[PDB]
Design a protein around this ligand. Sequence first.
Ligand SMILES: O=C(CN1CCCCC1)Nc1ccc2c(c1)OCO2
Length: 330
Amino acid sequence: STGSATTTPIDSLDDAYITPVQIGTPAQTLNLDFDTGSSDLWVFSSETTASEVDGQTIYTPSKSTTAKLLSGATWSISYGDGSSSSGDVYTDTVSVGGLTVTGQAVESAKKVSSSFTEDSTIDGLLGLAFSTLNTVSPTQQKTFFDNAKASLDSPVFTADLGYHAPGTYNFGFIDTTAYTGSITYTAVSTKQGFWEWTSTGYAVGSGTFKSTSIDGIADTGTTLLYLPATVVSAYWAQVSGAKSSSSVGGYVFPCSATLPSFTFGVGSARIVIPGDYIDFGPISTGSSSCFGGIQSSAGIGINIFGDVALKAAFVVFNGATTPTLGFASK
Ligand SMILES: O=C(CN1CCCCC1)Nc1ccc2c(c1)OCO2
């Protein structure tokens, strides 16, 4: 089997991407944030605290003849950005782009943090990291990919995010029309539960390539590109007027600037991030100071190949017995 779904930016900055997901019988369609940085499928629901729901589409398990309460199970997640949610669990039929999983654990939110309430465009998350990070207790649950894998034509999914435009999540097959050149695969460590790999280096704009190992994770659920302070400093040093601002919380730059590209290595291959992909607009409405799309990972504990980077590539998440990651230009 295979599945193919369109993923759409939630706003004009590509702050995140939502993919429609069918849950239950009859289907209830919710727009979820596919996150290869986490491993919980959770949704806004008829159980969520009233005051914490503002615009979201909710899952109502009582209206689904295939929903079953997973007795005693609870879940609680805290993301790297300080956001969080928690609640109880059902199993139900979940379909993504024509691909169906029966008995998928659907984590029903009773509580969500302010930042989730405040974004009416995201109805929940669908995690695509390794199930070792799943937060369900006392019986840890499998991710959608994990549940479908044996059934897929090939045990893979692919992320094809667009820049200021919709893209595609495919399951069980690689679309050889969606990229240029060849796909370069690279080793993954599953030790921390993430799609963790090692980039071979970078270049700034038309700069020379610097050979250097950068360990990080492929994270579709993180918007920006978070790299070592040295790297980030070398990038913003090419933009006149750019500065690290503690008060805004990162590198900002004059909105009148033309940003240079950023290249990262994948083995002997190179992925080029165009300068415009690194512009995240005024720091506040009407400001002529713009927020940078490349930021320091110092203080995070890990480097993150966030959407800013992934959207410049066609990315293969190969969940074979020994997982690997694949990157192609497009
Ligand atoms: O919290 C996030 C992303 N976040 C995920 C939940 C929705 C809002 C965006 N960043 C993040 C993502 C993966 C990480 C990490 C931090 O530290 C380690 O792995």
